[PDB]
């Protein structure tokens with residue numbers, strides 16, 4: 001009802017329940033400073049555009065505007081860059097390099113500093129042991145530019 | 160750390176509430192690549208709201224942080240200074256009498 005009421009157009013609007021509210025909740029949303037309204041409206045425009053696209057006597061008319069996860073992904077990625085002054089970055093600057101913890105022992109240990117505060121060993125006290133934060137010599141000549149991004153996408157959630 | 164690793168060695172598996180990985184019919188694969196997993200996950204997430212933020216695995220106490228001698232002797236040998244200490248016994252030698 002809130003998505004519809006302002007569109008006077010007789011054809012109704014809806015999402016469809018294949019949406020992943022959990023995949024929105026973090027991967028799609030990061031720090032974003034509310035005004036999620038901007039997201040949902042940006043989607044509603046784009047979804048309506050493809051509807052009026054097919055409205056030109058194309059192969060079928062599903063008789064309702066239907067939002068889709070792809071337009072939410074596009075919308076959120078646009079929202080991170082239309083705010084072009086923003087210093088931030090998306091979560092997924094990384095491909096083919098998904099945290100290959102077996103390629104070497106050191107890769108087998110980067111995961112320590114993330115897996116632990118993910119509370120998988122315990123619901124830690126948040127008030128005793130100093131954090132195993134990493135100060136990376138790593139491969140000194142080259143690598144580092146990639147390294148942090150690679151782990152950050154694949155076992156964490158923003159950069 | 161030793162106590163935590165013993166505790167983790169107790170918490171070392173999903174001892175309760177295993178994953179409900181029931182497999183439905185092998186759908187008639189006239190087309191597609193039988194990627195049933197994503198559809199099954201979407202269906203189960205929609206129907207059960209597993210992320211309703213109330214259930215917990217609770218395979219261990221999250222408590223009972225036992226402490227014991229058992230690993231303390233991993234002190235082994237300390238990498239201490241003052242294996243050679245002539246400088247520091249000369250430090251005492253400055254106060255051999257009460258002067259300064």
Ligand SMILES: Nc1ncnc2c1ncn2[C@@H]1O[C@H](COP(=O)(O)OP(=O)(O)OP(=O)(O)O)[C@@H](O)[C@H]1O
Pocket residue numbers: 139141142143144145146147
């Ligand atoms: N171990 C590696 N395996 C594969 N490609 C690598 C590796 N190390 C570096 N590269 C290449 O270089 C990139 C990451 O290292 P890069 O040369 O950008 O670092 P850098 O600019 O020296 O880092 P820093 O941020 O410390 O200045 C990767 O995108 C890849 O193209």
Ligand SMILES: [Mg+2]
Pocket residue numbers: 144145
């Ligand atoms: Mg660099």
